Design a protein around this ligand. Structure first.
Ligand SMILES: *[C@@H]1O[C@H](CO)[C@@H](O[C@@H]2O[C@H](CO)[C@@H](O)[C@H](O)[C@H]2NC(C)=O)[C@H](O)[C@H]1NC(C)=O
Ligand SMILES: *[C@@H]1O[C@H](CO)[C@@H](O[C@@H]2O[C@H](CO)[C@@H](O)[C@H](O)[C@H]2NC(C)=O)[C@H](O)[C@H]1NC(C)=O
Ligand SMILES: *[C@@H]1O[C@H](CO)[C@@H](O[C@@H]2O[C@H](CO)[C@@H](O)[C@H](O)[C@H]2NC(C)=O)[C@H](O)[C@H]1NC(C)=O
Ligand SMILES: *[C@@H]1O[C@H](CO)[C@@H](O[C@@H]2O[C@H](CO)[C@@H](O)[C@H](O)[C@H]2NC(C)=O)[C@H](O)[C@H]1NC(C)=O
Ligand SMILES: *[C@@H]1O[C@H](CO)[C@@H](O[C@@H]2O[C@H](CO)[C@@H](O)[C@H](O)[C@H]2NC(C)=O)[C@H](O)[C@H]1NC(C)=O
Ligand SMILES: *[C@@H]1O[C@H](CO)[C@@H](O[C@@H]2O[C@H](CO)[C@@H](O)[C@H](O)[C@H]2NC(C)=O)[C@H](O)[C@H]1NC(C)=O
Ligand code: NAG
Ligand code: NAG
Ligand code: NAG
Ligand code: NAG
Ligand code: NAG
Ligand code: NAG
Lengths: 271, 216, 416, 49, 50
């Protein structure tokens, strides 16, 4: 709201300490987002590794486990998701996230390896080794179907599993517009920032939308009035933007809390 | 006679370069799908009102339509703008000239009392012109490239680039054409709102009206 | 600075944001169109012959770019005094047009040319308007008028009772015989020519020497300006933070060469939200590029006032090539989250204590910044005929804290 | 804020584009409420009798 | 002219008070959400087994 002008700062310093509280609110929401990510993803205290040889009773997890060929160590479905969606001028800045994609992938791989090899016991102490078929037996026994069913229909279940995972991979590959929520969030953020930076060109009832023009054309007596009008207009716009950011941050926090509950309950156990 | 102007009459409004951006503006333009007064004055050049800038066109590929006289009284009492061609230079005279009954020109002079300013500059062809006046500045645009989308009719999309600005600052209300001794359209423009799509190189490739259709 | 911002004498372990820095501008550059279309003012002052005062010569000047500084410092003028206009500012004003008045007068009649003055020629040959005139220039002309000039080539009008309105010429030569009662009661007599000739001789004195006089009358705010003074320009600089004034477009940034191409009629481009991104200089007609100068907030990482008194300072989002006592300091560490100075870099990895970003977070063992460690590492020996069954059990107790309420406040409305 | 006036609209268009985001927010909450009730109630694919 | 000065003071303090009220509303909503979560935890994990 000054753009490197001394008299603007001189007139500004008498309005109080708005900048302090604005920066405080923004820092608060930023720290909150960092904590949200760290809480939703960090749930295990080790980084497990899949065995070099894989024989899961006939199942096939090749498309879901991490791929060593890719330097990013991202599995196929993660690559499809990353390739599907797609999105410092005058004081606006964007700070990088604390957690980068690599350790996020490592966390997800650790969770997947734990839920494959061990089951639900790695979320309540130390992980234990257990064959996969003898884990599906327990998970069927959990829903009232006696374990006699699984050991006599193993091949059919394996075939249905593989066909379903192939179908879902094809559906993600072909059918678009299935990731609306993330794209909408990104578009909302970009649009809000764009309109905030657009608001500069408005006149707000003054002679011109640029300060140095009116500073080089007239004398103070009406110049402080014009600068006051511009200052109050820009302050109002900035305050509105901050309030909108606060509301959106609260909503995202609620959704992230729900996601954390879902992952902690369903992934590490049986619902 | 009457004719329907399909989509002609879009010009660069300002001196700003852009790239791959859809820009919405509100300014004086010729409304789409409007009526134009087809004239065929051949073997008849009546006075026509100015009314805030006019369109202009032609289709003959020779020097018969020569000059455009502008003014408010068509007499030596008030200054009249004369734009005429000599196949080698364009001479603009803003000095006071008297009335002409049947001027003939091609490559009339009554009197030049109280002269103030002078200016000197450099399927058939279409010469699309737009004459605009605002805040004492008289702007003349032009486009001299014909595209044969259809034959015998002016269909297609083309842009107009400014060629000359005049800081004369005069009031005019009546303009007439000058011919030789032995087929030009006219259209009026309104304060409409447009959306324009720019190319990668800064060329206007499409314009959409904002007050024509619900889809628009 | 941290103690100032926190407004306390004690600071706990963590990272704080104190202020922000920016790169200061260095010099200024202004540029203007290559050519400077001059004005034919030379034919005015160095003209051959000037008419008499009663038939002084007019001319209209407009759409010019003329400099008065080159004329102000010229010493070939007897007197150059202007009314209400500072000559040194004459190059910084724009007018609609000017009228130039040329004639020649006597030596002693110079003072008569002024508004609200009395005299024969100030009211009978030329009357100055009761406002500001552009101004009058007068210079000696005895070498071309009092030596080779005609004896009666110059005339004035000694005609009274006909006080002329400002900017009025009476070139009508009528014999002044009233033909009525108030002239000796006779008609035909008292017939005297309203005009009279100057009587001059070679070196006849000071008040009788010829003086060439030119009066400039200005018009301001009558129409859009067409005549203006020239503006000086300068060379350009590259890869430095500079403020610029290209043809009235002013702004600060760093100048680079650009690969874009403009159509031959634009003046300057932009991208979005009225942010200029490309200008072409009038002299060279080359397309340039503007980049905003680097700026950003600072931050301090401190392990706590109680423990130690040494801190590590981190500049956010700046490539460490120009940081500028922390000018050189210690081992500069450039990361993806900016440039950190005052702390060492280690090869090992440990838990995370003071988050910094981009996957790194520093700690106080001096201050060491490393790469975040995700935890321990193990691989379970999966095999299709082996299970693990616990044999002992432990019972633990945890804690969990949850707020449920906050203070109920109320502010008086009109009292505040 | 104008009540079918020309001078008021001319002075209002000079203040920026507040009303765009105002209308956007209102339409957003309206759509959100419609989706809310539809998601709460529509939990069956068929209709039994 | 005292009325002009008082208008300046009143408008400034009005914006300050509005900002304070809005912040209070946001924080109160967040605390209410946390309190609801705590109530669920107390009703579920204490009076029974989870
Ligand atoms: C698990 O599924 C993957 C699906 O890609 C199988 O990999 C394909 O296997 C076929 C048959 O051997 C090959 O023709 C393809 O070239 C493989 N795809 C790729 C990308 O290499 C994999 O064989 C399956 N594994 C099991 C045990 O069924
Ligand atoms: C924009 O300008 C570029 C460069 O002038 C144009 O690209 C040229 O197109 C012609 C026509 O096919 C080719 O012969 C040239 O080799 C191209 N030059 C380059 C450098 O690629 C381009 O066509 C113009 N229009 C658009 C929309 O980009
Ligand atoms: C009138 O003529 C004189 C003499 O030619 C001019 O003075 C010269 O101006 C040029 C301009 O570059 C200088 O280089 C010369 O040194 C000057 N000579 C003298 C003796 O002064 C003067 O500029 C002319 N002025 C006008 C208004 O025509
Ligand atoms: C711009 O003014 C300068 C002043 O002479 C000229 O520009 C250069 O002139 C030198 C020789 O006078 C040439 O060798 C350069 O190639 C010119 N460079 C450019 C960019 O023009 C010239 O008179 C003027 N040029 C233009 C385009 O107006
Ligand atoms: C900061 O800027 C410097 C430029 O001085 C960058 O240095 C690059 O170094 C590599 C290796 O020698 C060169 O190939 C590049 O050409 C250099 N860049 C330039 C612009 O010349 C350095 O990489 C930059 N650091 C960051 C983090 O951006
Ligand atoms: C299970 O662990 C507990 C301790 O965690 C063992 O109890 C200890 O047993 C030793 C040997 O009898 C005693 O000296 C300790 O005082 C016991 N500790 C406590 C806290 O009572 C127990 O023996 C273990 N169970 C088995 C089967 O070995
Ligand atoms: C002129 O407009 C009238 C009514 O708008 C229409 O009937 C007529 O066809 C038009 N003339 C054309 C299209 O040549
Ligand atoms: C063309 O005619 C105009 C007006 O008759 C004249 O001013 C101009 O000089 C002519 N062109 C040339 C090259 O003489
Ligand atoms: C010449 O015309 C201009 C404007 O058209 C006018 O101001 C001026 O008085 C005129 N001159 C004469 C002598 O009529
Ligand atoms: C044109 O006319 C308007 C009013 O009819 C007047 O205000 C304006 O000064 C005139 N301009 C010129 C250049 O004659
Ligand atoms: C510093 O820590 C020690 C030990 O915890 C404590 O006794 C002392 O009071 C602390 N000082 C301050 C200023 O906090
Ligand atoms: C880490 O070890 C590598 C290999 O020995 C060495 O090149 C590098 O300098 C070490 N890091 C630091 C900060 O010294």
């Amino acid at each position: 709201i000054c753009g490197d002008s001394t008299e603007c700062s001189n007139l500004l310093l008498q309005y109080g300490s708005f900048c302090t509280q604005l920066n405080r609110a923004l820092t608060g929401i930023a720290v909150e987002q960092d904590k949200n990510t760290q809480e939703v993803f960090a749930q295990v205290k080790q980084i497990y590794k899949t065995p070099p040889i894989k024989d899961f009773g006939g199942f096939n997890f090749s498309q879901i486990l991490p791929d060593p060929s890719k330097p990013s160590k991202r599995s196929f479905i993660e690559d499809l998701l990353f390739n599907k969606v797609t999105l410092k001028f005058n004081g606006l800045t964007v700070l990088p996230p604390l957690l980068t994609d690599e350790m996020i992938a490592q966390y997800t791989s650790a969770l997947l390896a734990g839920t494959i090899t061990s089951g639900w016991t790695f979320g309540a102490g130390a992980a234990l080794q257990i064959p996969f078929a003898m884990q599906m037996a327990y998970r069927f026994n959990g829903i009232g179907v006696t374990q006699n069913v699984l050991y006599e229909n193993q091949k059919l279940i394996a075939n249905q599993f593989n066909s379903a995972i192939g179908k879902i991979q094809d559906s993600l590959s072909s059918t678009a517009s299935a990731l609306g929520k993330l794209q909408d969030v990104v578009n909302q953020n970009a649009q809000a920032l764009n309109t905030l930076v657009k608001q500069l060109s408005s006149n707000f009832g003054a002679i011109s939308s640029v300060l140095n023009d009116i500073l080089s054309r007239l004398d103070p007596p009406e110049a402080e009035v014009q600068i006051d009008r511009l200052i109050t207009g820009r302050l109002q716009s900035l305050q509105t933007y901050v309030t909108q950011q606060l509301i959106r941050a609260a909503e995202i926090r609620a959704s992230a809390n729900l996601a954390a509950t879902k992952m902690s309950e369903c992934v590490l156990g049986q619902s | 006679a009457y004719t329907n102007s399909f989509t002609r009459g879009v010009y660069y409004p300002d001196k700003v370069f852009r790239s791959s951006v859809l820009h919405s503006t509100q300014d004086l333009f010729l409304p789409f799908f409007s009526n134009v007064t087809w004239f065929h004055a051949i073997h008849d050049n009546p006075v026509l009102p100015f009314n805030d800038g006019v369109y202009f066109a032609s289709t003959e590929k020779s020097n018969i339509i020569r000059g455009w006289i502008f003014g408010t009284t068509l007499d030596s009492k008030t200054q009249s703008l004369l734009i005429v061609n000599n196949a080698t230079n364009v001479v603009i005279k803003v000095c006071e000239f008297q009335f002409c009954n049947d001027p003939f020109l091609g490559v009339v002079y009554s009197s030049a009392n109280n002269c103030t300013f002078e200016y000197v500059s450099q399927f058939k062809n279409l010469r699309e012109f737009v004459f605009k006046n605002i805040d004492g500045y008289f702007k003349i645009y032009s486009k001299h490239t014909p595209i044969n989308l259809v034959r015998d009719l002016p269909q297609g999309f083309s842009a107009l680039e400014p060629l000359v600005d005049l800081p004369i600052g005069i009031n005019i209300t009546r303009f007439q054409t000058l011919l030789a001794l032995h087929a030009y359209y006219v259209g009026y423009l309104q304060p409409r709102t447009f959306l324009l799509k720019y190319n990668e190189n800064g060329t206007i490739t499409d314009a959409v009206d904002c007050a024509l259709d619900p889809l628009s | 600075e941290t103690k100032c911002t926190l407004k306390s004498f004690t600071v706990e372990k963590g990272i704080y944001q104190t202020s922000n820095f920016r790169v200061q501008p260095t010099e200024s550059i202004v540029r203007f169109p290559n050519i400077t279309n001059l004005c034919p003012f030379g034919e005015v002052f160095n003209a051959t012959r000037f008419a008499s005062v009663y038939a002084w010569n007019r001319k209209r000047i407009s759409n010019c770019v003329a400099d008065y500084s080159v004329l102000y410092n010229s010493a070939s003028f007897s007197t150059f005094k202007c009314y209400g206009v500072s000559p040194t500012k004459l190059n910084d004003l724009c007018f609609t047009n000017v009228y130039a008045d040329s004639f020649v007068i006597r030596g002693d009649e110079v003072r008569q040319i002024a508004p609200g003055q009395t005299g024969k020629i100030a009211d009978y040959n030329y009357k100055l308007p009761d406002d500001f005139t552009g101004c009058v220039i007068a210079w000696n002309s005895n070498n071309l008028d009092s030596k080779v000039g005609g004896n009666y080539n110059y005339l004035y009008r000694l005609f009274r009772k006909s006080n002329l309105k400002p900017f009025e010429r009476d070139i009508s030569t009528e014999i002044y015989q009233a033909g009525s009662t108030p002239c000796n009661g006779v008609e035909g007599f008292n017939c005297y020519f309203p005009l009279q000739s100057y009587g001059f001789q070679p070196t006849n004195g000071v008040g009788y020497q010829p003086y060439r006089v030119v009066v400039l009358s200005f018009e301001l705010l009558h129409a859009p300006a067409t005549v203006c003074g020239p503006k000086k320009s300068t060379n350009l600089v590259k890869n430095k933070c500079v403020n610029f004034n290209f043809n009235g477009l002013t702004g600060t940034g760093v100048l680079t060469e650009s690969n874009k191409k403009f159509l031959p009629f634009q003046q300057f481009g932009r991208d979005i939200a009225d942010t200029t991104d490309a200008v072409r200089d009038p002299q060279t007609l080359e397309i340039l590029d503007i980049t905003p100068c680097s700026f950003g907030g600072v931050s301090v990482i401190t392990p706590g006032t109680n423990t130690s008194n040494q801190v590590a300072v981190l500049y956010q989002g700046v490539n460490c090539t120009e940081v500028p006592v922390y000018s050189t300091g210690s081992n500069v560490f450039q990361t993806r989250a900016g440039c950190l100075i005052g702390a060492e870099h280690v090869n090992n990895s440990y838990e995370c204590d003071i988050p910094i970003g981009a996957g790194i977070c520093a700690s106080y063992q001096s201050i060491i910044a490393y790469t975040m460690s995700l935890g321990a590492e193990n691989s379970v020996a999966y095999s299709n005929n082996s299970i693990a069954i616990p044999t002992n059990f432990t019972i633990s107790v945890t804690t969990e804290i949850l707020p449920v309420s906050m203070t109920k406040t109320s502010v008086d409305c009109t009292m505040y």
